[PDB]
Assembly symmetry: D2
Homo-oligomer: 392 residues x 4
C-alpha cells in the first residue's frame, strides 16, 4: 500500500558518478583524490579542477550519485548536516524570516534559536504537521521553511506536497525537507515539491557510523547557483576520504534500508504489544496518526522507533541500563542498534519547556534499530523491559 519503490535506485546507487572512463586507470571504483590543487594549462581557466575546496574528483562523484538517488539535477556535500543547514541559511539575508518545524533535531533548534537569530533573521517554530498553522504563520518576510518528516524524535509526519503548495502559493520561499530519517530510498521530497532535500549523511546515507557529513540535493538552477557559491565561499566542505566512505556506504543503501524496515517494523510491533510500553510511535504502524499519509508519500519505513515506557524516569534508565545488544549512544542510522533518552541526550539542547510541549518527556525513548538478527533485538528489549517492570 506504500508508494512503489523508485525505479533503478540500486543500479544508480552503484553506477552514477562511478564511470571508469573518468579515470586514466579505468578504475571500477573512483580513486580518493586528496590533492588540494591541480595543474593548469594556462592562467584563468574555464576548465578542470582548480582547488579542492571548490571542487574535487571524489566529492563530485558522490554528489552526482546522491543527486540521482534524490531524483535531483544537483547535489552539494558538506562537513556535517549542521554545516549543510548553516550553508542553506546563508541563502538568506538580514530581515528575512525562517519558519522551522517545531520538533527537530536538537542541533537544528539550537542553530536557529541561538545563532541564526542574532544575524537579522527572525525564527518562528511552527507545528507544520497542521498545514493551516504553516499557512497562518507565513509572512511577507518568510523566505525559508525548514521541515523534518518524520521529526526527530517524536516522529510527527508532515504532508510535503501540501506544505509545498502552501509555501509556493505566494512570494519566493524555499521549502527544505531534512530527509535524514527516511533516506531517498523511502522518501523523495523533491518529487513532492520541496526545493531542497537535505541529509545528515552521518546517519543512514553513509550508514557505517564513521563519517560526519551533510548533503543537499536541488533542482532549481538559481538556487543551485546560490548554494554552490556558498559551498565554496563558506568552505564547510567534507574530506575527499569521507566522500569516498559515504559513496561506498551508498552502494548498500537499498539492502540496508530494507533490513532497517523489516527489523524496525518487528521492534515496533513487539513494543506495541508489550505491557510495559505506554505508547509506540512508528510510521509503519496503523496506530501512527499519519500512517495513511506515510503510505502515500513514502515507499517504506526506517529503523527509527520512538516509544514511551510506562512508569517514570527511573524505569527508562533501568531499561537502558539493562540493554546488552542495543548500545546507549547518540546518533542513528548505522548498522548497530542504538537506544537513547532524547530529553537528556540528543535534545538536551532544546529548552525544557519546549521539550515538554513537544512530548519529549523523561519516559520518551528513541531507538535506532540496526541490521542485527531480529530475534536478538527482540530478546534484548524483552529482558530489558522485564528488568524495569514498570507498573503495567
Amino acid at each position: 500500500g506504500f508508494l512503489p519503490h523508485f525505479q533503478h535506485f540500486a543500479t544508480q546507487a552503484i553506477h552514477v558518478g562511478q564511470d571508469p572512463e573518468q579515470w586514466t586507470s579505468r578504475a571500477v571504483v573512483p580513486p580518493i583524490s586528496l590533492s588540494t590543487t591541480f595543474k593548469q594549462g594556462a592562467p584563468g581557466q574555464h576548465s578542470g579542477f582548480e582547488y579542492s575546496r571548490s571542487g574535487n574528483p571524489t566529492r563530485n562523484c558522490l554528489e552526482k550519485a546522491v543527486a540521482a538517488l534524490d531524483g535531483a539535477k544537483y547535489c552539494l556535500a558538506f562537513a556535517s548536516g549542521l554545516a549543510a543547514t548553516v550553508t542553506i541559511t546563508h541563502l538568506l539575508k538580514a530581515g528575512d524570516q525562517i519558519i522551522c518545524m517545531d520538533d527537530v533535531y536538537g542541533g537544528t533548534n539550537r542553530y536557529f534559536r541561538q545563532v541564526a537569530s542574532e544575524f537579522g533573521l527572525k525564527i518562528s517554530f511552527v507545528d507544520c504537521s497542521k498545514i493551516k498553522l504553516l499557512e497562518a504563520a507565513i509572512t511577507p518576510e518568510t523566505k525559508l521553511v525548514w521541515i523534518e518528516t518524520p521529526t526527530n524524535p517524536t516522529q510527527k509526519v508532515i504532508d510535503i506536497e501540501g506544505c509545498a503548495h502552501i509555501v509556493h502559493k505566494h512570494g519566493d520561499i524555499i521549502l527544505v525537507v531534512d530527509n535524514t530519517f527516511m533516506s531517498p530510498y523511502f522518501q523523495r521530497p523533491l518529487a513532492l515539491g520541496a526545493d531542497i532535500s537535505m541529509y545528515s549523511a552521518t546517519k543512514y546515507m553513509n550508514g557505517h557510523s564513521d563519517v560526519v557529513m551533510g548533503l543537499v540535493s536541488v533542482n532549481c538552477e538559481s538556487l543551485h547557483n546560490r548554494l554552490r557559491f556558498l559551498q565554496n565561499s563558506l568552505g564547510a566542505v567534507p574530506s575527499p576520504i569521507d566522500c569516498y566512505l559515504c559513496n561506498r556506504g551508498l552502494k548498500t543503501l537499498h539492502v540496508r534500508m530494507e533490513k532497517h524496515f523489516k527489523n524496525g517494523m518487528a521492534v515496533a510491533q513487539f513494543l506495541e504489544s508489550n505491557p510495559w510500553v505506554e505508547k509506540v510511535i512508528y510510521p509503519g504502524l496503523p496506530s501512527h496518526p499519519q500512517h495513511e499519509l506515510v503510505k502515500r508519500q513514502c515507499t517504506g519505513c526506517t529503523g527509527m522507533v520512538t516509544f514511551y515506557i510506562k512508569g517514570t524516569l527511573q524505569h527508562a534508565e533501568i531499561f537502558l541500563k539493562n540493554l546488552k545488544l542495543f548500545t546507549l549512544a547518540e546518533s542513528l542510522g548505522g548498522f548497530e542498534s542504538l537506544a537513547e533518552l532524547p530529553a537528556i541526550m540528543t535534545h538536551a539542547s532544546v529548552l525544557k519547556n519546549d521539550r515538554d510541549v513537544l512530548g519529549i518527556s523523561d519516559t520518551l525513548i528513541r531507538l535506532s534499530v540496526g541490521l542485527e538478527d531480529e530475534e536478538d533485538l527482540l530478546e534484548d528489549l524483552d529482558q530489558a523491559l522485564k528488568a524495569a517492570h514498570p507498573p503495567s
Copy 2:
C-alpha cells in the same frame, strides 16, 4: 638577527597530544578514530558525538595549541570555515575591519556574504597604524589581519596593532598566520586574541588536506568558539586530522628549508634584469624588513614579484616553467607559481586589485622543498623565454 627560535618547538610538534598513555594499546602514534558515536554508561554521562569532539581531532588541537603558545585550539573543515566560525562570534549591528590585502576568499566572504547579515565591513590598510585607529568605531568588534598579506606581502606590526585595537574596548584581533606558521611567527605572543590558519597550506604542508585552525588563550573567547565549532559543524574529518598532525611533525624541518629556498629565489629574482620588483620579507628591500626580524624567527617560502613587460610576458614565463607548477594554493613540498589577478584573487574586484597593486604582472611563487639549483635554473630559463623589455 631574527627573533631566536621558539624553544621546544620540534619536541612539542612531535610529542604534544601524542602521549601513548591515552590509548589501551600504548600506540606511539594516535589511532584514527572515525567512530561518529560513543557508548555511554548512563544517559548524559568522555566522548559523545564526533562533531562535538573526538580523539583524533582533540589530539591535533592540543598539538597546534602548543605550537602557537596557546591554551586552546579548534580545528575546522577549511581556513574559510574557520573564518566563518570566528565571524559568528559577532551579531547584527557589529562592524568588521579587514586588512585591505587578504586571501581572495576572505575578501569574498566578508564583502559578499557577511555584509548581508547585519555586519558592516571596512577594508583598511592596517599596515599604516593611523588608518586603523581612524577606522575604529564603537561598533567595531573584529579586526581581521594577515601578515604578510596574500599576495602583496604587506607586513603589519602585530603588537602595535593589538595595542591600538585593545585600547578601546571589546575588540577581537585575529591574525591569519597561514603564510608564516607558528614556527616563524606567534601572533598570540605579540598580543593577538586569535591566531588562525588555513592548515591547507604550510601547517599540513603535504598538499592533501583542506583544514582550518584557530588558537586562542582567552577563556571566554574559547568557550564562544567551542560552542560554534559544535553548533555550526564545519568540522574536519578525523582522518584529515591524523594527516595534518602527521604533517606537523616535519613542520620545523620543512619551514627551515622553505626559508633557505625562498631566500635564494628572492635574491635570484631581485638581481635578475627581467624582474621589475621583488617582495620578500627576508630581503633588505622589503619596506618592513626590520619589523619582520623583530616579530619573526625567520621567513617562509612565499615570494612575490612583478615581471617586466605585460601580461603577455607573465604568461610566457608561466608557460615555460618546467619544475614549478602552475596551480593555486601554497605551502606544500612542491613549488607552485600563479598569477593572483586571474587565479586565486579573481574573487577580488578589479578596482580593488588595481588599488592593492595586484596587477596582471604580479606573480606569486610558493617555493617548495626541491633542490635549490633546480628551482633557480627553472626560473632563470623561464624568464629568458619571456625576455621582457629590460
Copy 3:
C-alpha cells in the same frame, strides 16, 4: 530446502571484536591504529580476525595481504618432500602458485577432481599433507562434498584439509562445520564486497595448526594494512544483506540464461540442473552471485556478447556490489595451461558472471540485449 541460516550471523558480524570497552574513548566503531611502535600484531587487525573467526564458527582467524599470500603462508606449513593435492579446477592464481612456484621448493603438486570423492581417496599417499579444495570451483563451479572429503582425508595420516570458501562466504557455507581444518578466503571478493581491498583470511579451530599459522603470519610478514582491516571489517557488517541480494539476483540471472535459446548451458548451484544441486542444499544455506554459462557458437559470439554489455562491466575479480563479466580462458585463467583449460571445460565460450546488487530488471535487460547482439 537449504541448510537453515546460521543463528546470530548478523548480530556477530556487527558486534564481534567491536566492543567499545576496548578503547578509552568507548568508540562504537574500532579506531584505525596505524602505529608501528608502542611505548613499553595490532588492534584493528585483531578486531577483524575475531569477527571473521565468529562468522566461520572458528576459534581463530588470521588476516593476510591477499588470498595468494594466505595460500603461500598455508603452504609454508609444509616442508620439502610433502605432497599437495589440489582441486583440478581452481582460481588461476592458485594453480599458478602451486604449479610454478611451490613445486620448485621440494613440494609435489597433484591436481585431482575431488568432486569425485573416489578419485581423492585414490590419490592420497603417505606423503600427502595438504588437500586444497574450492567449492564451488572457480570458474566451472563443480561442487565438492566437504564432509565426505573430510572423512576421507582424515581417515589416516595427518592431512590438512583446506576449503577456499571465497565464492560462498560463511553466510552460505561453513567448511569448518563440515570437517575442514581451514576455511580460507580471498577477502578481496565477497567478504569485503566493495572492490577496494586486497586481503586474505584464514579461519582455523585446531590449536597447533593455529600456532603454526600464527608463526608464519609473523615470520613471512604477508600481513594486511590496518586501514584495509578496518575497510574489510566495515564491509563485513553488510555481508548478510549483500549475500542475500547476490542470491536473489544470481538466481534470476541463472534462470533467465537457462531459458534463453542462445545459451548452451548454465552452471549455477541454485538451479536443479546443476549436477550437485541436492548436495549444495545439504551443505549450504543458499547460493551466491556467481553464474557460469556457455554461449552457443564460438569465441566470436562470446566476444560480441561481452562488447555489448552496458551494465555488467568487462573486468576481472568478483564478489563486489557491481556486476562483472569475463571470459576466463583469456582473462583470470590465462595462467592455466591451455591443455588443462580444455580438459577442465574452460573453453572459448565459457563466460563467468559475478552478479552484483543492481536492480534485477536492469541486469536481465543487459544480458538479453547483449545475447541478441551476438545472435541476431
Copy 4:
C-alpha cells in the same frame, strides 16, 4: 669528506611518479586508487591495469619514486620488509645456497633459519666484515648473498663494493644489501655494485612510524622480471593507502635525514665526551673503526647511535628508567627519539627530530641518575 650528496635527490623525491599528466584531474598529488579491478575494452588485450595485486596506480607511483631515489631502473613494493625478503628468497629453488651475514636483522635470520631452510635451501651464516671469509664460503650452489650495513646494534660497516666484486667474480650470484637503516639519501648499494637494495620502509623511508612496508630496488632486467612475477604470484603486496603514506613520507626524507644526522652527531659527540660512557659506536665519529670506509661508501650518517654505559646492567637500567623524552620501545627510524637495551651495558638509541638541546638534556639527566655525583 663523505661522498658528495646525490644530485637532484630532493627534486626527484617530490616529483618522480607524481606527474599530474597521469590523471584526468591533473592533481598535483597522486590519488589513492583502492579499486581492485579495472574496466577492459576487450578480453585479454595488452594494456592498462587489470587487477590491483598485479599493479595499481598508487603503488606504481611509489615504486617509480623509490627506484629514482636508489638510482635504480625498477622498484617493487611489498607488505613488509619480511615479505620482501621472502619474495626475494623465492628467486631461488630447492638445492641453492644462501649465504647470510651473521649480524643480520632478527626477522631475516629467523625466516632463513626456521622457514627457508625447510624448503630445500641451504642457509650458511658467515662473517662478511672479513672479505676472505665470504670468499671461502662460496660454493657452486651459492645463488644469494645477503648483507646489511651498518649492522644493528653494533654498527659494523661492510664494504659493499668489496663484497660485490668477490661475489660477481664467482658467477650467477645475487648480492642483496638491506639499506633499511641508511636510506638511499645516505647510501646507494646499487651504485656500489649490489644487485638489490632492499628496505623495511617501516623505518626511515616512511619515517612516521605508521607504515609497515617493504621495498626492493633493482637494475637487472631478468632479475626484475623474476621479482615482478613473484610480487604478483605470492601476493605479499602493500595496501594502496600505505603506498600513498610511504610516498608522502618520502617527500621529506631529505630534510628528515639531515636532521637525524645532525641530532645523531650531537648525541654521539655528547656521549663520547662523557666520562660515564665507556664507549660510543657511531659511524660519523672518527673513533668508529670503519670511519673511512663510511666516508667512501656513504653521504652521511643517521640517528642510530649505540653506546656502552660505564658500570653494570643496573646502571644501564637506571639510565633507561630515568629517560623522560626518549621513549622506551622495541622499534626504530621514526621521528621520535627511542631507546632500547637489546653486553649488559649496551644501549641502542634511535635519535629523532626533536630539539637537540632537549635530547642532550635528557641523556645527561638520565646518566646522572645512574652515576650520581
